[PDB]
Each structure stands twice: as C-alpha cells, then as structure tokens.
Symmetry: D2
Subunit: 308 residues, 4 copies
C-alpha cells in the first residue's frame, strides 16, 4: 500500500515566517491561502471572525489547518479559535521569534513541526493548538513568556501537551476545559463581537481608563488586577458602579501565572464581578466577549469562566 500524505491548509495572517521549507512535501501536501496580511499587534475581531468562519467552512476540504501568525497576539487568537472552531480536525497556529531572513531563523522548523502536529491523527480533539520550539501547547494556557526568546511560548499553569522529536509527538496531556465543538459559542453569523476592554492596576492607578470604557458603553471590562485579581480602590469603585448597571466585569490579574480565584479578597457575588481563573487579562477578554454573545448574567458568565 503506497504512502499517502495528508492535505494541510496553511492560513497566513501576516508575512512569511520562513523564506521555502522544501522538507514539508515529504510529510504533507500543502496548499496556502492568505487570509489577511497584518502585523499581529494589529490583530482584531474581524480577523478572528474570518478565521473561525473559514476553518468551519473549509473543514470538509482538508485534513488539518496550520495558521501562521505573528507571535504577539497568537495566544489570543489561539484561544478565540479554541472556543469557536467546530471542525474536528487539528488546527495548529505557529509563528517565529526570529525573522525568516535572520541567522538561525526559527520559523522553518517551527512550520515543519506545526505541519507534523497538524498531520498527526493523535492531535485531533485536543483543542486548537500552538506549536513552537518543538512543543505542542494548548491554546487556552499557552502564553508568550519572554519578549525575544525562541522558547518564549509556554503553558505556564498546566504545561504542554507533548514534545516533538524527529517528527513525532509524545502526547501525555490534553486540556480538560471545554473547547471547540463542546462550546456553545457560534460566530458563524456574527458581524461583530461585544466590546471588551482591559484596564491595568498598579499603585496610584487612575480610574480614567475604566471610566472611559464605561462611558463608551463597553459590554465588558477585564481588570488586570494586582495579586489575586485585586483592584486599586478608584478602579474598583468605577467598576462596581458600572456592574450595577449591566457592565460585565471580570477580575483577572497582571500576575503572569496563577488563577484569580473566587472566594478570596473580593466578594464577586456582592459586586457583580466574575473571577477569571487562570485566564490572563487578554485571555479573559476572549472568553468574556464570547460569553456576552450568550448572556449578560454575571452568575452565568462566572459559570462559563469555570467551564471554558
């Protein structure tokens, strides 16, 4: 029985991350589309919606997706797609911490291993994935850990799903949080997403950013609080008042690992707030936006934040 290489679609959102990688046509039949071409620091709602509708639409036509993405916001898009993709085939985002034209450019081998991952039958049903520096990382926990390191992407709370050696993956973990077709989030018909902004906390923090998003009518605000999701008093006060009038308010934390818990120093039930768990501010944003498509009920949003 002859060998039959799987069909992998590469959806590009930005420039090239290798530049191509000839060794790919030994492990797969690759076709490419350019969906957008933006620096990922300009990543946005409309790109997310395109990617989710594109993956869900083209599911039938291929064996897996690799998405090439700037590293800056890959962790946000990864998680959005983790929640909105309904396609049962592997979806593997990949990027490069050194540019394709650089010495020891890292994109070529990351792309190789991204395709390996996307062709591996064992990668399906693990959620949307991020493959970087020989590692398969779940889209929920993966975050950018260092501003330059090639090893920067890590799942800082629950670890990676497997490591990649010589084109093979040893999977020892899968995320237990509900993803992809187990979520109720369906963007197939949405033209926009609810407006969710992020305010930082720190000593002497001004409440003017919070007030501005409130006055703008934002659907939700994520607080990147201090410690275990705590807020500077003025920020607290502004966000407490907004919640009494329907603004969703998720307490996250600027602290780079660890859950922002319930039943700690903030009485969320009293105040109408939601605890983000291990979702960092930009990740809590992704889930809050998608939550607000179902409900503005803070008890139900908290539930969503305990399931997804």
């Amino acid at each position: 029985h002859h060998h039959h290489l799987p069909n992998i679609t590469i959806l590009a959102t930005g420039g090239s991350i290798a530049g191509a990688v000839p060794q790919l046509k030994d492990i797969a039949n690759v076709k490419g589309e350019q969906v957008v071409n933006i620096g990922s620091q300009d990543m946005n709602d409309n790109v997310w919606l395109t990617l989710a509708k594109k993956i869900n639409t083209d599911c039938d036509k291929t064996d897996g997706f690799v998405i090439t993405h700037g590293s800056d916001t890959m962790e946000e898009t990864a998680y959005f797609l983790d929640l909105t993709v309904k396609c049962d085939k592997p979806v593997v985002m990949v990027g490069a911490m050194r540019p394709s034209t650089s010495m020891s450019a890292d994109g070529p081998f990351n792309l190789y291993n991204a395709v390996v991952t996307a062709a591996d039958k064992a990668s399906a049903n693990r959620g949307v994935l991020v493959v970087m520096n020989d590692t398969v990382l779940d889209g929920r926990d993966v975050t950018k850990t260092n501003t330059t390191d090639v090893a920067t992407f890590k799942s800082v709370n629950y670890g990676p799903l497997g490591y990649i050696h010589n084109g093979k993956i040893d999977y020892q973990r899968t995320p237990a949080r509900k993803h992809t077709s187990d979520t109720p989030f369906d963007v197939s018909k949405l033209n926009e997403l609810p407006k969710v902004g992020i305010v930082y906390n720190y000593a002497n923090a001004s409440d003017l950013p919070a007030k501005a998003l409130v006055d703008a009518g934002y659907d939700g605000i994520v607080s990147a609080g201090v410690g275990n999701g705590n807020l500077y008093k003025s920020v607290f006060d502004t966000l407490a008042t907004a919640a009494k009038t329907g603004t969703a308010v998720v307490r996250s934390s600027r602290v780079p690992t660890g859950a922002t818990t319930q039943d700690a120093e903030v009485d969320d039930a009293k105040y109408g707030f939601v605890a983000s768990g291990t979702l960092n501010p930009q990740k809590a944003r992704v889930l809050l936006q998608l939550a607000l498509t179902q409900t503005k009920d803070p008890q139900q949003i908290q539930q969503i934040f305990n399931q997804y």
Copy 2:
C-alpha cells in the same frame, strides 16, 4: 552587641501570636531577640492594592531621615504592589544601610502562615553587613531579591517572588546568606532622584495592549494632562494600531511615552520593531509596566526630554 533594626509597617501584621496579656512583632516572632534589636513603627495601614504616591514619598523620607538612627530597615508591605514600592525606594533611598521589604502570601492566622519565617529572614538580611550597598531588597521565601528585577510571578504561591530576568542575589539558609550577585544597575545613592522636597509626583499611567485594543484609556490619560504614559505592549513593546496613533500624538504634544511589555520577562528593546527616535518614545528595557511607571515618574522630576529619559532608562 546586636544590630538595631527598625520595622516600618504599612499594613496589617505579617505575623501573629505572643500577644497574650500579662494583665508586638517581637513577640509574634520571639527569635528576633537573637538576631537584632527590633523597634517598630506604623507608617500607614493599607492593603497594598491601594498603594499610592503619598505612601511612597512618606517611606523614602522616613528612611532617609532616620538612616542615622538605626542599622537597617525592614518594611512589611502587602504583596500585591510590593515590587513597585521596592523599586521606588531603590531609586529614592539614599541611606546605604539595608532596606528589606517583606510580606506574606498566606494570612497570619492560617495554617503554615509564611509571614513569621519571612520576617525572621528579612531581619537576618537587614542585619547582615553584606546586605549593604546592594540596593533596596525584597526577602521572600528564603531568598534575597533586588528591588529592580523582583516581581510577583503567581497569584497565590508562597514562592511567587522572583527576579525573573537576572535572578536572586543570595539564598538564606539557617540565618546565613551566601550572596553571589549584586545589581549592576545604579540605585539608592547613585541615582539623582531626590524626593525629600516633593509633595507629589508626576502623573504617570499605564495602558494595556491586546487585540482590538481601545484607544479610550490612552486618550483618557491624554485628556487629563498626564505627564507620562507607560504602554504595556504586546511582544517587544509593540502597540495596537489605535493605541499607537494616540501615543504617537501624545509624545509630540508634551507627554512622555514609554514602551514596556505585558510579557512577563525580557526587555522591551531599542532597535526593534518601533522607531523610538521617530516617535519620541522611550523603551523600558526589562522593566515591566508598573516598574517602568516608577522610573518614568521619577525621570519626570528631572526632565521631559525623551532622549534624557532613555538614558535614565538605560542606567537605573
């Protein structure tokens, strides 16, 4: 002959016990009697999530005024913003005697409360002659950490405090420190920041970057006339287009603008994907956003010139 150690408290008790009435931290931790002569003062009482410029100015004046009246300082402080105060004092304290900050990640009435042993080791540190001229320090989880790099890495772990870029100065075992490192960046009496005469600090605020980021936080700070704005950028200090547009205007209209990053480690570098000179921005290096705010505030007490601010950010 034991060193005199002053304890400046800014909140609740880091350690409990020993308070039973015959008819207070040196009772909670009786073994302080073995290593120092401890006197305490309550400077303020607040949770550190409410920390503010006024407390900072108080602490630095208190230490610089009372330097000659003691051999070292321990500051008990909430853990949420400890890393911001430690860097502030690291730049404003002119006393070369050790200033050690400590807190607790478990409340003082809880099983396996960490405050009691933390306070002990912080006094050990404050009392070690070798701790002098290392800058302001944070002592947590058996570890001496420099006030510049130290940061809270985890929301609940007792080991949360780490110097995530250049690592600790020394470890504490059995009341002794093996220092193998000292911060090269200029601190305490090698900085020009003098806050002895200041009743306030320049308004500096922080905005976050993420996909689809609103410019409304940045614009709100511009409308209030903030003297500086720290961007918590994505990756190496990069900016969402709308935030970029607003800060680019701000830098040319009197606002000092510093690119840091939301990424928890690594420098936001010059000569990367933002032409800082074109835009009048300053890059924060390894200073995360809250730490960058500290140096930008004090930078603005000396200058508004973005090139002088960048040299400051390359030195302190």
Copy 3:
C-alpha cells in the same frame, strides 16, 4: 441530609510532618497507621512492597489514602505506587520541606491539602498523586526541583494536574501514561524486586561503577547519561557488553528535564538498550525493576517505557 465526612487513612513511613492539625476533622475522618519509620533517604524495595500490598489490601476499608513521606525519595515511591496500586481510590503522598517544629512549618497545610485531594471524588482515576505547596502533581512526572524550597516539587515536563485554593481543586489535566489498574505489574506475591542500579556519566567517567553492578549480576542498569542519554565511552562499552549477555540497560539522562529519546545519537536497537523518555534516572529505575518482573526482552522493555 446531614453531612458525611469521608474516611481517609494516613499511612506514615517516617516521622511527623506536622506536630496536631485539628482542621482535618472538619473535612475528614482520619485514622492513622505507621507502616515504617525511616528517613526517606533510606527508602527501599521492602517499604515499596509493603505500601503496595497494604493499599491493595485495605482498599475496601476506606475512601482514600494519604501517605506521609520524606521528600527526598517521594518521587520514586510515588511512581512505584503509580504502577503497582490497583485500588481505584485516591492515593496522595505528601511531605514537608520544613520540619514540623520550624517557623512557618509547611507540613500542616500540605497535610490538610493532601487530605482534601484524597477526599475529592474528582481525584480518583488520576494515578497516584503528590500534593505539595497547594498543588496536585502526578506521580510519574513529579520531581524534587530544589534542595530546600517549599515549592520544590514540580512536574517539570508536563505540568501539574490542578491547583488547590480554599480547599477546592480545579483539575485541568490527567496523565495519559498508563497507571495503576491499567498496568500489568502485580507485586502482591513478590518478596523482592529485580536489582537495578544507576550509574552517572560525566567527563572522564570511570566504568568501575557499571562494572561492579554487572559483576554483581544486576538485572538492569540505568545510565544517567549526559545530554540526550549519551554515555562516556568506557561506560558505554561496559554497558554494551553487559547487554549482549542479558543485562537490561536503560539510557536515561542526568539532565533534569526532557526526554531521552529513541532515534538520536545512540542506536539502541543495535546495542540492546532502552530509551527512558522523560523518566529521570531514579524514575527509570522504578519502571525497569517492574519491567523485569515481566520480561528481560529489550524490545518489550522499550514498549513498556513507551506505555507507562
């Protein structure tokens, strides 16, 4: 319906780690047995066999086990029990990096959370566990990372299974490697375990340790090699010769994280060696001993090392 606290047995192998913790009788009905009393640096085969036979024997009589253990070798016993326990109820090992009589002693809260973990219905079917510093860690990957830190125990390759806040656990992972009742390893009738020793590699490494265990007739030798399971030439040569005459030889690595892979710089098939994967030397020992109770066939031992 009144509350009914679960019955947790604490098997002690050494001194006290708290000293007791009254808050335990709010979350469980605790009974204690002393199985042995040794410093865990003298941990041994006979203690392991006792613990496995005791857990399997007393399964019916309780709702979960907590085992208090010295921290030095907890990661070895944890993994042994991970492979030999057949009891479907939680088995949670716990220890203390500061002694019970010390300031801010860590044992009392570790023991609390060990019991929480052992009483949590969600902890069952996750393998044998290690609970340390608010964290639930799987017995296979957990290792001692620092010589003194209270946070020392971490699953350095695949991360922890959940974190413990306010007596509750958020499980987001479970180990995929086969454990407990999914292994064929049955020590219920064994009086001894096959002899497996560990040799270190380094520059100018003497082959005399390897030779001594060979000459002693050791059933298996684990090499704590350098890098990706490589060996100093003289150690290599001695171990190659022993394998030709039936000695099992597993290539592990002194390097503290990362798999010792197959298909790298050693041709294991040629030489009769087995790659340890992410099992560090002392962990590879545990699995090799148990492997040699089934087989001396290096291809089958390699398979075991890819399944357990």
Copy 4:
C-alpha cells in the same frame, strides 16, 4: 580596528556553509567579519560525551599560553559536558581576556540550526570589553552565562542552558550586551589552581543516590584508590544508608568525600541533616555533582584536608 578572536574547536563544526570551492567558520558565518578578526584552531575532535581530563588540561594551557596573542577566546564544544569544561576553565584560566564557550543543540545541517547565530553572539561576547573579568562564560540562546552556575537543564531544547541558581549575566540583542550581573565567586586569576605543570588530575568519581542504592559503585571507586568521591545525594545531600556507610569509611581512610545532590537546583548546605565535621565530609553548595567533581579534582591538587576543601568549596 576590530578585536582579534581565536576560536578553539574541540569537535565538529558548530556552523556549516560558505565552503563552496573557488577552484572555515568565518565563511559559514560571514558576518564575523563585521565584529572580529577570527582565526581558528582545532585542539581536539571529540563528542563531548567523551570529554576527559586531558582535553581540559590542553585547553587551559592553550589559553594561558596564547592569552597575549589575542583579544579573546571562543571555544566550540559539544553541549553534553560543556558546563563541566566551562567551570574547569573558570578555575584554571589566568587570562583575563574573555573565554566564551558555545555549542549547538541542533546539528549544523538541520532546519533552524542554532549554531550559526550562537557562534555570532559568542564572538560578540568574546569581543565585548565589558565581558572581561567576568570569568569563563557560556553563550547560548542570546544569553551570557557564567561558567559556574550554567548547566544543561533539558535534553533537546535550544534554550536548555541556564544559570538555574543565580541567573544570567546579560542578554544579547542586536549584537549588544546589557550586563547586569557578575559572579561573586572567585574565578580565573583569583583562584590558586594552576595546572600549567600537570599532566594528570586527581581521580574523582561520582555516585548516585536513590532508594535501595547499591554501595558497589562507591566501593568500586574506593578499591581503585580514587582521591575523591562526589555523592549525588537525595535532597540536601543526603545519602542512602549503604552509600553512607561506604563513604563514611572512605573519608576516614584517605578519600576526600563531597556531598552534592541529584536535585537540579539549590545548595547542598552545611548544617543540615548530615554532620559533615563528624564524618569528614565536604558540602558542595550549589555545585551539582559534575561541577563539584571539577572543584574537588582541583582542590586535591592543593590539599586533602577536608576543612581546607570545605573553605575552597565556600570560595570558588
């Protein structure tokens, strides 16, 4: 005017390419021409899993002999044992010019090979005036690491090399280094170890601890008359009873015995669960077993007295 950098190769090529015949590392990495004047020498050709005392003695003599003939040194070396050679040279090199070691975790013919950029940054380091008097260095993955603390933390990761106890000295961005740290432990010309006249080194071997550990490795080293034995202990240097019994006899019968630990970070401390003075042991501190072996070997060229060995282990 560019610094002269000598490259001592101990194995294969760290970088390939540029070798096409008109009818070699400065061709593989043409951009060396921009930062230094590179001359190469092949000292030995071996995989570093086979590294040995003879290579060590060669490298230290070569650097100390040719110090005056160049401005700095880069040593390309296999990654398996790099951390052992870097510490050896850190104690035996008397040239204060930078000695930078580099290797590669991906082979030089592989996708995204790391050697080419590693060699570049190692030359950057060797060529930076600020890299002098910091001891022998390892430059991997954009990071200057001190030869004492640096270690291989992961079997395959390109970022494997870390100073797991006290952290890096500086990071490399765009051919520049921001040094914020320097090792306090005494190195290079501040040590008494002089190997200029030595054709061999004292026999020092390593034994592992684990449950049910055989004493046969330890006894085998005792039977061969080894001058030292490093224990890779469990936890804080603790010993399995049978290994303990054998090393306790060994320490009183002429064998130097050093307690290190298999645990990948933290010190094996004095004044813990082993009475070192009772037994004539020495504690290795933060030196893992292979690094402890290095200093014990060189310690034994000066003394067999366990108390003098412990002071050495407290100083270097």
